[PDB]
Symmetry: D2
Subunit: 300 residues, 4 copies
């Protein structure tokens, strides 16, 4: 009797992580950009830094030429607005070729002094690119998954838990709470071998408001989230996704810029989808608006 | 700057799956029990067999001897009631030692002609035990998770998607729908190496009703689930968990036995938590009650 | 251009050593037999013990029941003659199946309290069986080989270097000299992965006289070997192979028994080829003769 | 008790070959140089091509800048003398760093259109570099060794067996004979995992005359070698090492150039040891003299 693998069409060796690290090692400059962006984001999350984190990028990378072009531009705005914003580029996507393309893109962008952000959707894919990642998001459909909370608990970067697809806040609050503890999960070593990973716990996790069944970017939605975080004993540190089920992106940015201007220190990050999705012209516009809002927040 | 593994306390090689298969190979009898229990469950799920699937076991295995003792008893009742019930034992839990204990327990129970059922929480631990598994659940917290639906799509056994922790049915309906397609995910080979797994799709998935905010086992909840499956184009095949957030387990069994007696052919399985959690005396009682209900279902 | 593997017909993963150790772990009795036999052989090689080492077995194992039967008999003579002889059974041979058969045979024989001896032809297959090996030979054709001297340098058991196929003594003297230093060589971990092995050096290496252009077992050959070891600064500890190019095995045994009787404390081991190659009756005869020779050696 | 690895100070994972191939892939130009040099060497060995193979290089590479400089010069002489000589550079050597340095050096040299030659001491390190190797030697100490003959049997390039350290010709003749059969040996996959390698047999193996107790390069030694190859049914194709125990290098070159001039078609290759060991000025003199000898061989 064939009981084994009756539903597997094919199972093929993946390059071990070490193969991608050898082919595409972090420069000293990449390694620094990553280290600095992770510290900066930590400082912003806890309120030691009054700047806003801004994860902004394409909906997805289809063409690496276009991404590198976007990165050159965004880099200049990262430099100019570095006193009001900490800008990080969202980079979202033969699987071996896919991994080579991905790591190489990430390395190049970090090596130009632009930190990068991604989506952690599995427990094996971080072993190939997390050394080039300054921030990651766990999806709304994986925020209650124990292995995804356990993964967060052992990641070197800060992490955002999206709320559930129906607006549920509690799963993210529990996710953040869980991710701060030590845990165990199964994945592979750098050498590609099945492994037990024991984590130390990650204090740098926070909620992402991405809509749900009702846009959660309102001041009262933000007020209710903040209070739910405070009750649970967590830092009231909140990132608002302008895209996805919050839509229109320009109207969200106006509404959020308001709250920042009124003096809401609880809103510590935002996410924006931006292409060469709003256009590049509108991307600059919104960034300058949020910048203005942060500076006004310093005062009022 | 040390960017790698800043939150990993320890990472150690796990035994490759091949090490546990070599130490604890399936006997011809184990292999048969597994193959036959998976076919039988398939036939029950589609309505070709009018027997009920019954996944019944401890809340968790704390002590293998107690489990082996429970298995000896349950086996005799599996044999006696086999014309009305297909009884499968729920087996739930140094990680290397843990894996040796688990596989050895599973092998012994299957080798005694008692099929076993598990819970898949990750994409790596199936490689160690799935060949001894006649059925598995995806938990309420992972039913919406892409990687878990992809896993289901490539598992050799039937799979139950629990509804969400708040009673939400839709995620299971979508899960079943997704699990029937071919998919890709990352895990390891039998040899323990990082891998791409390409799946062929699994038609043998069904919902599990486990409660949510309020219990969801009553005839009107079952009626609304059935209609929700039918509208989505799926076989109205429903398993009811008597435990968890449906509680009291004896009252659920009474209520369900009723519906089976009334002639509900759409209820094709149940789950029960039972120790040496209800006692052995009450475990036999409930099994005989469901058996009676199935017999009465034959007649009308 | 296809430059890679043009002359490899096929390359297939071998079971990692850990798979054979998990399937066939050393019993407490195996582990002890091995530990004690290796210490005893050490003591005999250095002159602290006045018994003779006797490596005796089939030309090769073709049939494991015949080997197990041979082992039962040899074991009784090991027990009876243990005051004069340290008897060790020579155990020489789908490669995965071959490895399972080999380890299982070795484990059974050691678990019955009969230590085993092998031949190291390569640097990878020790990882599968060395933990059950109380002694090993490097063959005449590899005694000069750097990789084999390096392997000897890192093995847990005593090792014999056969002289060259033409009678050359110096390669063995240099082999002993080399094997006692620390070295490095490439092979695999228990987990099956390519590896660097750093060795501590093995002082428990000695020459084996097997013949050459003409037999080399007589008192004059032994005298010149002893003097060649002394001049090189090494312990005059000599093992004489009764078989191979020394033939007459019994005539060799008579001649060697003589030298032992006359009081030659430099002859510390012998090799005998013995089947169910001399017969079982002649195997007992020779063992009792050497026993007698050891006893008589005590008295002079 | 503690029977495993009592003489292993440390054992560490080595980069899998795939990590070095991914970091330092063969360019199109490297791959071609290798393909062409291996075919050319084949043609010279069998007598289809009346040029001489010349393996010439440093005693060993300590400094890669000096090697690259040597390679640039040798390359110009490879190009100029290509009608009379097929010139190949001898390239001999944290082992992970060592492997990176080695592969990178070899890749650079082949990518400049200069084929490279090495020395096979083990069965694992070919997986890292053999794809950049146009030719290799088995040394005098391993020519008789079974695993080395088996390795030769599965290598993609031609191979030379040196005669034994005492002048013995027969081991090389037997080595050639054995290397042309299919064999099995243990080593790793490109992925770094323990493996069985099944070979197809390598007809492109030949003797290397490297001395012994007395030099073996004169016409009468060559005559006796040739006749020993002929009687064994083998192509009388002979390579003469000018170095090692043949010394003086310039006197050997004179004597050999003679035999080539007198019309000896059986001498198909030579080895020379050369750094910027004879000097660069003397390296050109012998190459041009051998060139002249080849040209004279063409005529009478
Ligand atoms: N390498 C990850 C942690 C990790 C290890 C192993 C598996 C998965 C994730 C990091 O440095 O963030
Ligand atoms: N072995 C699983 C399928 C699988 C393969 C590889 C990784 C994970 C899962 C089954 O038979 O159900
Ligand atoms: N396992 C061998 C040492 C060894 C390790 C690795 C490769 C080869 C040999 C011994 O214990 O004696
Ligand atoms: N890769 C070698 C052959 C080889 C394979 C595996 C192990 C060792 C050697 C060659 O191509 O010539």
């Amino acid at each position: 009797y064939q009981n084994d693998d009756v539903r597997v069409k094919q199972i093929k060796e993946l390059l071990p992580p070490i193969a991608l690290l050898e082919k595409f090692p972090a420069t000293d400059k990449a390694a620094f950009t990553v280290h600095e962006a992770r510290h900066a984001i930590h400082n912003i999350l806890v309120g030691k830094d009054d700047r806003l984190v801004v994860v902004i990028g394409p909906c997805s990378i289809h063409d690496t030429k276009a991404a590198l072009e976007y990165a050159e531009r965004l880099k200049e705005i990262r430099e100019e607005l570095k006193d009001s914003l900490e800008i990080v580029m969202r980079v979202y996507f033969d699987i071996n070729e896919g991994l080579r393309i991905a790591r190489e893109l990430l390395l190049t962008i970090n090596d130009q002094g632009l930190p990068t952000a991604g989506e952690f959707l599995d427990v094996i894919s971080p072993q190939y690119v997390a050394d080039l990642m300054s921030w990651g998001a766990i999806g709304a459909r994986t925020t209650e998954s124990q292995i995804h909370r356990e993964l967060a608990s052992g990641l070197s970067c800060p992490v955002g838990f999206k709320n559930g697809t129906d607006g549920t806040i509690k799963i993210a609050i529990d996710a953040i709470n869980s991710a701060r503890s030590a845990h165990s999960f199964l994945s592979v070593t750098k050498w590609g071998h099945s492994a037990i990973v024991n984590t130390s716990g990650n204090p740098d996790c926070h909620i992402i408001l991405r809509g749900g069944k009702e846009p959660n970017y309102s001041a009262e939605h933000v007020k209710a989230v903040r209070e739910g975080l405070i009750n649970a004993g967590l830092i009231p540190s909140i990132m608002i996704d302008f895209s996805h089920a919050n839509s229109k992106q320009m109207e969200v940015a106006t509404d959020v810029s308001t709250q920042l201007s009124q003096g809401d220190r609880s809103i510590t990050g935002v996410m924006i989808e931006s292409h060469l999705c709003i256009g590049w012209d509108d991307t600059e516009k919104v960034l300058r608006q949020l910048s203005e809002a942060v500076i006004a927040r310093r005062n009022k």
